[PDB]
Amino acid sequence: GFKQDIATLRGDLRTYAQDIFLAFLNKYPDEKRNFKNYVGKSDQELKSMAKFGDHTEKVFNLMMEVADRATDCVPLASDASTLVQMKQHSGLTTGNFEKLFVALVEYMRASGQSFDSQSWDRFGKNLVSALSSAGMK
Ligand code: HEM
């Protein structure tokens, strides 16, 4: 289920983080609008870029902590508040996060592996609600 999925993703986190974030940026190419230096790069080129590796690993390091601290796929209000309050997320709306979780669920569905895709779908929706409650537009 959900907790085991966190362990699976942590076990190869750099590769899952890059593959899932690339699935997001390829499904919703307009989200590259939020990351200038990503436009006109292939996936291999992005994976070469220091900053891409470091942003995407920090995103998934913290996401896995938020999933880990959740009860039954409901994240802590404190985690939502932290994500809203981050200066790096100043321009963002809940829709950005919704799209990341849609791509993550599709990635899991397409994988040969027994991820609990329905639990990640619920976790995404719960996180979007929490972010709205914590003040995200
Ligand atoms: C649960 C989801 C997410 C988590 C846990 C998260 C976490 C983080 C973390 C920890 C950083 C600091 C990393 C760094 O600059 O070293 C960061 C930066 C950033 N995040 Fe998020 N993030 C999430 C979703 C998103 C989404 C959906 C977007 C845009 C669509 C976004 C845009 C950014 C941007 C632009 C930065 C700074 C730019 C850069 O990477 O150099 N994040 N995020």
Side-chain angles (χ1 to χ4, degrees), residues 5-32 34-35 37-107:
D5 298 343
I6 300 172
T8 295
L9 291 173
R10 285 181 161 157
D12 201 6
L13 197 60
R14 173 54 80 101
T15 135
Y16 284 119
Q18 292 179 332
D19 288 353
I20 296 162
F21 210 77
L22 292 163
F24 164 59
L25 298 171
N26 294 325
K27 185 174 183 75
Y28 305 104
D30 293 350
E31 299 289 323
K32 286 193 172 204
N34 300 280
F35 319 86
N37 23 252
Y38 292 182
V39 171
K41 299 296 169 63
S42 78
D43 289 4
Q44 282 316 281
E45 289 176 300
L46 285 175
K47 290 152 115 331
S48 86
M49 295 177 67
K51 24 147 101 276
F52 177 90
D54 277 33
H55 166 76
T56 64
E57 192 140 44
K58 278 185 189 168
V59 165
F60 277 77
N61 285 340
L62 184 50
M63 186 194 295
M64 296 299 104
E65 292 198 20
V66 176
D68 209 15
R69 284 190 292 260
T71 292
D72 281 343
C73 308
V74 177
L76 298 181
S78 58
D79 281 322
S81 194
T82 293
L83 289 169
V84 168
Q85 280 181 316
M86 278 175 67
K87 56 178 180 161
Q88 278 144 268
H89 291 170
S90 168
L92 301 185
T93 71
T94 58
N96 297 110
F97 291 84
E98 191 265 350
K99 286 173 186 62
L100 177 55
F101 281 97
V102 169
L104 180 152
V105 169
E106 176 212 317
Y107 172 90

